[PDB]
C-alpha cells in the first residue's frame, strides 16, 4: 500500500519552524532529493532525510 | 449526542469561527487526528454534580 508521495519541490517557510504538510502549500524552485529513512520503534517515529 | 473536534483559530475555516459548522475542515481534521495519536481524549464533566 502507498504511504506517501514525496513532493518534487521543498515548501517555503519564511518564519515557521514546523510545517504540517497538508495538500494546500506553496513550493519553492529548488528540487527535493530524498536520500534515506529511519524508523524508531520505541516511540513510533518516522524520519525521511535528504 | 455531542460531537467534538479540535480546531486552531488562526488556520480555521470561516464557519468554525462563528459556530455554524457541521463537518471539520482539513486543518481541523488533520490536527484532531494528530492529537489523537499523541494520546488526547476529551471528556465532559458536569459541574453541579
Swiss-Prot record, chain A:
Superkingdom to which the source organism belongs: Eukaryota
Localization annotation: Cell projection, Cilium, Flagellum membrane
Tissue specificity comment: Testis-specific. Specifically expressed in the principal piece of the sperm tail (at protein level). Expressed in spermatocytes and spermatids within the seminiferous tubule but not in interstitial cells.
Assembly description: Component of the CatSper complex or CatSpermasome composed of the core pore-forming members CATSPER1, CATSPER2, CATSPER3 and CATSPER4 as well as auxiliary members CATSPERB, CATSPERG2, CATSPERD, CATSPERE, CATSPERZ, C2CD6/CATSPERT, SLCO6C1, TMEM249, TMEM262 and EFCAB9. HSPA1 may be an additional auxiliary complex member. The core complex members CATSPER1, CATSPER2, CATSPER3 and CATSPER4 form a heterotetrameric channel.
Family: Belongs to the CATSPERG family.
Stated role: Auxiliary component of the CatSper complex, a complex involved in sperm cell hyperactivation. Sperm cell hyperactivation is needed for sperm motility which is essential late in the preparation of sperm for fertilization.
Misc: Catsperg2 is absent in sperm from mice lacking Catsper1, suggesting that stable expression requires Catsper1.
Protein name: Cation channel sperm-associated auxiliary subunit gamma 2
Species the sequence originates in: Mus musculus
Location of this fragment in the whole protein: 441 to 490 of 1145
Curated annotation (Swiss-Prot), chain B:
Underlying gene: Catspere
Protein name stated in the entry: Cation channel sperm-associated auxiliary subunit epsilon
Family, as annotated: Belongs to the CATSPERD family.
Subunit details: Component of the CatSper complex or CatSpermasome composed of the core pore-forming members CATSPER1, CATSPER2, CATSPER3 and CATSPER4 as well as auxiliary members CATSPERB, CATSPERG2, CATSPERD, CATSPERE, CATSPERZ, C2CD6/CATSPERT, SLCO6C1, TMEM249, TMEM262 and EFCAB9. HSPA1 may be an additional auxiliary complex member. The core complex members CATSPER1, CATSPER2, CATSPER3 and CATSPER4 form a heterotetrameric channel.
Species in which this protein is naturally found: Mus musculus
Subcellular location: Cell projection, Cilium, Flagellum membrane
Expression sites (tissue/organ): Testis-specific.
Protein purpose: Auxiliary component of the CatSper complex, a complex involved in sperm cell hyperactivation. Sperm cell hyperactivation is needed for sperm motility which is essential late in the preparation of sperm for fertilization.
